[PDB]
Amino acid sequence: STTIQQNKDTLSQIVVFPTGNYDKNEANAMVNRLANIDGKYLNALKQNNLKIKLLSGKLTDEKEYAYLKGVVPKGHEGTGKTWDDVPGLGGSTVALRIGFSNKGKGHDAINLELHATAHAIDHIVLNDISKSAQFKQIFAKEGRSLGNVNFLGVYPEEFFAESFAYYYLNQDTNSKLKSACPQTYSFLQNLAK
């Protein structure tokens, strides 16, 4: 409850809200779900001046993402979707469309903001640990146990981000990850120490 508030205070320095009209209550709900991430990661994001940009429209309508217009994201071959239609982005930056958090809202991630932010944690905070030898061994055994095996089972950085999201979204998804991917669950458990 207190670390939740502390994480929300940290996020107030990371989250950028869009200009103009947007769904405020849902924006706050997205931040609330982000607050479940271990505070150690959020503070690292804050130190690197990583911004979580909440958007009222397409990602590609932002100047910094205009170069991705018409670009098919990694692993989206055959989906017919380009970055113009994708509601979330993570890595060196984080950009998220308000209202698209839940699985099925233009994506099949367990939660949009946690998945995208996990990428930034992976890349900025953990220096691409998803591509380390340790995790690749785990990814080789369990990367196909969370569905979407041609995306999660193929890219370790995506399996990491999606497992991270399962681990921190809520208690139900946390239990599901443990049963499905016990070595990944333990990996993320140790990472947070």
Binding site: L89, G91, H107, A109, H119, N148
Partner: peptide, 7 residues
């Protein structure tokens, strides 16, 4: 670096 969500 950029990474998309699960399709």
């Amino acid at each position: 670096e950029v990474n998309p969500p699960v399709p």
